[PDB]
Symmetry: C2
Subunit: 181 residues, 2 copies
């Protein structure tokens, strides 16, 4: 179908050794496949959204739960590893969108759905962090919005291995997505 | 602040022994707690929504072909389980009681739940029912994105998957910021 890739929260703070909210080894371990995945989408001309947690704010629900992270302007928010130059190489491309988000789901309070419908996109490929938090919530919205969904299981990770497994099974058995190797 | 209870898919098909999609005993073991909870809300005059899956002749529904028919209209599989059924029948006339059919996992999706919550100025959403890591989870994701305070009644939710159940309760507490009440 018409395809888009949503590349979620692959930042320093979520992957880096001293990431302010780091997921650690599982997150860095996917670096190579998510970079290839994204590059491939970009080069084939498919729509690619870098959906990135963005924080300035005692009104944000997460300020109760978590340390400061993915703060606007800081190195923690930058895309991790080889994904940062991939993006910098392509940030002007028509089929590349850098989209700041304020909740776990890439859809919530954003214009992602608007952009996807403009482009008549019908299949949404999901990659990034975490499998059972931002990828999950995104997939829940995608599901309830009627999109076909592809989870790239070697391009997602979580700190919690059980959550990771649980999520992949949820995507397969409840959401009816395709979980791709 | 103003409270409502969303009592999710506590039906024969999801709880009974012979249920088309039963979670089995753990769904049956919460009957007393979920009935006491729901009755407490009803009698206190708080808003209560029985949110019930209603489907399976539509090859357009994502669920058909990929799940056996369940909570089908007219069938006693759709009936509330156990003592929840006579509680509902006794109060179904009440202004603070609503029966709401839903067609996806989340109680918000394609329903007028949010409309009704706004009208009643509900600020805090209490969730109970089945399954912890499916319908309860999807309802909670939506509730979270729509800005509600969320209370999960741990002893009034259950899943057919024990690992999913535990995972979900930590998710609600730690990611969604819900109160997980015991
Ligand atoms: Zn954040
Ligand atoms: Zn169903």
């Amino acid at each position: 179908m018409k395809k888009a890739l949503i590349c979620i929260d692959y930042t320093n703070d979520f992957a880096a050794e001293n990431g302010a909210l780091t997921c650690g080894e599982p997150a860095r371990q996917i670096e190579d496949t998510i970079v290839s995945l994204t590059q491939a989408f970009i080069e084939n001309g498919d729509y690619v959204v870098f959906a990135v947690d963005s924080h300035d704010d005692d009104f944000h629900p997460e300020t109760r739960l978590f340390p400061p992270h993915n703060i606007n302007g800081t190195e923690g928010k930058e895309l991790y590893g080889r994904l940062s130059p991939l993006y910098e190489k392509h940030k002007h491309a028509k089929n590349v969108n850098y989209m700041e988000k304020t909740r776990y789901s890439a859809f919530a309070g954003t214009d992602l759905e608007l952009k996807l419908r403009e482009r008549q996109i019908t299949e949404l490929h999901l990659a990034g962090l975490c499998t059972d938090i931002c990828v999950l919530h995104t997939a829940v919205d995608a599901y309830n919005k009627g999109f076909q969904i592809v989870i790239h299981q070697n391009a997602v990770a979580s700190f919690n291995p059980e959550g990771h497994e649980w999520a992949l099974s949820h995507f397969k058995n409840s959401i009816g997505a395709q979980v791709a190797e």
